[PDB]
Design an enzyme around this catalytic site. Sequence first.
Site, PDB file in Angstrom:
ATOM      1  N   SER A  28      -0.706  15.489 -12.129  1.00 57.83           N
ATOM      2  CA  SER A  28      -0.947  15.127 -13.509  1.00 57.83           C
ATOM      3  C   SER A  28      -1.183  16.388 -14.338  1.00 57.83           C
ATOM      4  O   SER A  28      -1.711  17.382 -13.848  1.00 57.83           O
ATOM      5  CB  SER A  28      -2.154  14.184 -13.583  1.00 57.83           C
ATOM      6  OG  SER A  28      -2.560  13.909 -14.916  1.00 57.83           O
ATOM      7  N   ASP A  64       0.831  -1.200   0.000  1.00 58.38           N
ATOM      8  CA  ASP A  64       0.000   0.000   0.000  1.00 58.38           C
ATOM      9  C   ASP A  64       0.868   1.254   0.000  1.00 58.38           C
ATOM     10  O   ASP A  64       1.363   1.675   1.056  1.00 58.38           O
ATOM     11  CB  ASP A  64      -0.904  -0.010   1.237  1.00 58.38           C
ATOM     12  CG  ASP A  64      -1.804   1.204   1.326  1.00 58.38           C
ATOM     13  OD1 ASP A  64      -1.918   1.920   0.316  1.00 58.38           O
ATOM     14  OD2 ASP A  64      -2.421   1.406   2.398  1.00 58.38           O
TER      15      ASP A  64
END
Length: 330
Positions: A199, A35
């Site tokens: 992004s 994770d």
Amino acid sequence: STGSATTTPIDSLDDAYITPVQIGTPAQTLNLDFDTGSSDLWVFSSETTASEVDGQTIYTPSKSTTAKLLSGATWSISYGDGSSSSGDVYTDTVSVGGLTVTGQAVESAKKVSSSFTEDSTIDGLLGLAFSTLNTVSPTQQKTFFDNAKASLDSPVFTADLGYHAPGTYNFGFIDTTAYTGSITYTAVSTKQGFWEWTSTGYAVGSGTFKSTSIDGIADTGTTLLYLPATVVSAYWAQVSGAKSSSSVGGYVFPCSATLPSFTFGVGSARIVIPGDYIDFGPISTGSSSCFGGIQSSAGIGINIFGDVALKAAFVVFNGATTPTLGFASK
């Protein structure tokens, strides 16, 4: 040193991925959920409340000759999906794919929430976010990666998750045969303890690319792709009959649909998520309403590039002095 381990979807939907991890001496192998959005290595154990164990493999520290109780240490964590666990702490030898760390903090669960009990395939979590998020008290502990880093050939790990198929976690090296083209690297902020990046935009299907900054986290422990409501609405508007359902808890779509791809930007590069990666199947057994793999982050407080996004790429988690993230197509 290096390590290399195969990671395997837990079910037919790729709801999560498990990777075998050797703990203790002799080794006790547990299948952990790696994770990159958390920083605790915790396991089901011989100390876990018996009624809260249902099929998981447990770590029994009394059977490990290298286990040592970390005196006074406790831990307690709550995840974004509302699940939680807590307990005490041992140090022990932990190996992943041939890479060994001695003295790793292994957080032994005394209590786990229902969603953990109900998932027989996940024996615990192995956190790969920054150690500043580790919950051990009163002395915070380091992640497996943080402990291994100085010994690695290169201070990196990579995630190569499969679509409906196994994939690989590598530590200490970049497998140049595992991706196509080049790896595009992008800046990371560690301010919130995550692999947080921005992004450069998105496209839906064969549509034009929209240049827009989307800050979010690379999180292998989250199944879906959570993005701003505007972006998500633009995606689902291209699927006839798709709608956001408050009762179900997100966007659903007719299972008869063909889903468009979704592209996200990494600098000037582009990662394309095929439409099929966005299908999470019937909302309930036998239903013709299917759950979407792209959902709104509104009310999460952060955008999350979970498995739906990451499995479309070869992803480098670069733990150099100034961390960065790399993405390549594959």
